[PDB]
Amino acid sequence: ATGRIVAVIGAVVDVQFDEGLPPILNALEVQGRETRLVLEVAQHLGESTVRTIAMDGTEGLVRGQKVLDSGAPIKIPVGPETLGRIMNVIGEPIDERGPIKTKQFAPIHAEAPEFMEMSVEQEILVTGIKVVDLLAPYAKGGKIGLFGGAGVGKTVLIMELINNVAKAHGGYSVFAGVGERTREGNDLYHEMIESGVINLKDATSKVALVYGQMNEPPGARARVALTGLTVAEYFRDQEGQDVLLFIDNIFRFTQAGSEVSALLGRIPSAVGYQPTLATDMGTMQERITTTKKGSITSVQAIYVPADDLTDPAPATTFAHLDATTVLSRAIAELGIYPAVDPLDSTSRIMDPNIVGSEHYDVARGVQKILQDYKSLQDIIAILGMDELSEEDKLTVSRARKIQRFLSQPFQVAEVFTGHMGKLVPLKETIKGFQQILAGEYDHLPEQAFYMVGPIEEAVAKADKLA
Amino acid sequence: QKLFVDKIREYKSKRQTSGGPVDASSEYQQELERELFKLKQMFGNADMNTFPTFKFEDPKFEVIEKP
């Protein structure tokens, strides 16, 4: 059907149709516009009128412009060739590298998988990263919060997760750029081209990029996470893969939804967020699941506004989080990479019913020994470093060897540093930390437990110190 | 009662299906192979159609007399 624009108020546009009204969540395309302007139906006002939110700038819109209906919510090109490629909320190539000659288009705004399609056993997603797979394991079809910043290397951790999940499993990755700074988006594009995760000249790229920048209307920034979610759902439900979906900031998703609902004239709620904050977060996070066909595991960088963990945005996001990794700058100043804080990183699948009593007990012991080392550290701050306890300094050196063994050379950082990227399986991590906890590797020096893979590489290095 | 005599004509048409196991598809198989793939993959990791042959292992033991 074809309607006419009857109102343009900032980013909201009221269109009026003569014969066929489009249902809510449907892409209308404005005619005559030199670029591709897409409105999304958000409301039916009656009198054949339809309120919509624009996915781009609304300047130059005239009351009377022709608006052509599509029939589907928004169709983005999905397929194995969106990988290594940038696109926006609408699904158009951003990278100036030509169109995406894919075979099928998937509509955004799908439904979360039915109850009977939910896989029912909680399972660990082995990432090959020691500190993560040991203390705060990721669950298949879970959500993870990256509590990192700028200083500590976080892009490296993301690229290494992409690489590992692509190698260990067969899973491709999607990176959504909700509300991201265009400068940082370009930086990330070039860092992922350099480190081999994106290949500009082959078909071996392991990640598809979707970006909604900060200079885009609230509608775009609100639907860009769904665009990334759709291009990941294709891989999951049509290739049986274990996809990894990153969301470079989920708080900007929340605040873009807040701005959208404010534009539509709705009454705000606690603090100012939308009245539909919980359902808007849920209709998205409920599609990141582990179905009987595959799985989507989501790593979502989190910003905590005003440093209040009880603010409605992080408090409604934490209801969906399954794990949590904290990239401390303090750990990075100690020279540990990845600088994952081993004590402030949490996981809900840590219990022995899910990871087994062996894994649970090794991780619990490592955690307790690290806590006791920080204790003995603040008591060593006495300046009276003595050893009136044998066990105290024994555990001091054990925990120093441990907290250095929670360091690992990443493959993506193989061009910058000569060190080779050593991803280590789960059982080898459990076993190595079991040995170090049992007191065996005492004769080994400290620095042979630094930027090493499994304990085999550790003892090989220890021998090679001489 | 026009729609029952509608339906069972179609039902008899669908019955003409011993020549085609899944009623003239040449589709819906590309996903069935994947679904059964998962099915077999974790129901077992061998020739589940077969009967199993069994390798057994028996305990360790040590010197338990007075050393």
Binding site: I24, H44, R266, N353 | -
Partner: protein
Amino acid sequence: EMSSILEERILGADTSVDLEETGRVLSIGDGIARVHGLRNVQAEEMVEFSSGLKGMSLNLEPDNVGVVVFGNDKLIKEGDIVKRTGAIVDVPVGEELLGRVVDALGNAIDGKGPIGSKTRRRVGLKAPGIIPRISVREPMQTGIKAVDSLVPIGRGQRELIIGDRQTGKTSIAIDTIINQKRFNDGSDEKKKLYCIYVAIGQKRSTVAQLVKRLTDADAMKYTIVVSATASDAAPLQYLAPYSGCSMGEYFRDNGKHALIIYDDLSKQAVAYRQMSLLLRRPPGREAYPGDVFYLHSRLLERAAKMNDAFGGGSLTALPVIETQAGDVSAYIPTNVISITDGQIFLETELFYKGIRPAINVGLSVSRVGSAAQTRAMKQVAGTMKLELAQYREVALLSRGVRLTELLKQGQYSPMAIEEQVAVIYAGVRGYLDKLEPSKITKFENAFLSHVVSQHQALLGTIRADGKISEQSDAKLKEIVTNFLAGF
């Protein structure tokens, strides 16, 4: 199978057509549909949209009807036809729901076919008055030592489980559901407890895994699960508790005993706040509508205990509330504390310090409490509570440490009342005052295995009598002292 289609699905197929009353959608938006027509529709009557959706006639206005849409308003367009059903919103009730997972409207989402229910019950019925009720007397056993000893729960009570996120509230409810297996399999049909678990705003994967934990423990055979998860429309998360409450009122009204868990009520209040703010209603504290108290109180008031003239049934409610940063003086927590009969405060400090279940004994209370304990549990738990109060005052001290470590318990491990009484006895008479604390749990484990592997007669006598007599007192004394000599 071929004729499983022409089964009766064609022959008996409701292919009737009837003179129906209709309205026409004027404007759909914000999960509310302004509908033109429906002149004879009733207030709070369920209407059906063209897409097969369903809604509730909220606002009867002179020129239109406001309809709350139970589902996604994406499937509704202006001009859609809306039919009356003539039935005020109601759900299927009956015993055919036990073992089934349903959504807030009674539709099966477990793929096991339709629910063969013969009775329907309104979701917005009124709670029983003053005369139909009677004081709580029968115990509702949870199988958790801490709860069953210090914070007892009777049948017909309302006991809040309040605490921060990830502190073990769902675990307490799930263990309470698993524990009723020993009663549902027995012979006495006045101790059977049919459990209902309403899941509101939760992750659907979490609800699937919950149904798995219930099926492995063979607890689904007597459990209804109503699921209105995070991705479902806010009206569905609003309705789910009343659907579950009517399914439980079916048992309460027919001389049986139901238990219902609302997990949780904070998310239902959030869904109702969404609906109210989208209806342009004035927001009060924390932007909540003025009638969120009524929202929770007309619901938790239906959990009653009838007298023997009204059947003698009951319905116990365990509403769950999630606090932020441990703030219990918030709006919705204090509302539900005003409604219920007690609390079970789960703490993050205790949960992080390995004390699980992390029940704060000083703050957990049960206004009914003593009137619904067994005699043996009362005998030992009175002294236990006195000694725990003494210990928290001085925070004897070693006795308190011993007892608090005796209160730790594992997940999915609900103990029978006799074995809880045995363990608490061994703890409260001093028989491990000199055992250093960290072995206590170990001792406890071993001890109970002993008492269940060999002294089944004593436990059976405690079960029959309900009290731990002087004969059984000295018997358990020699048992525990002999074991401690062996241990």
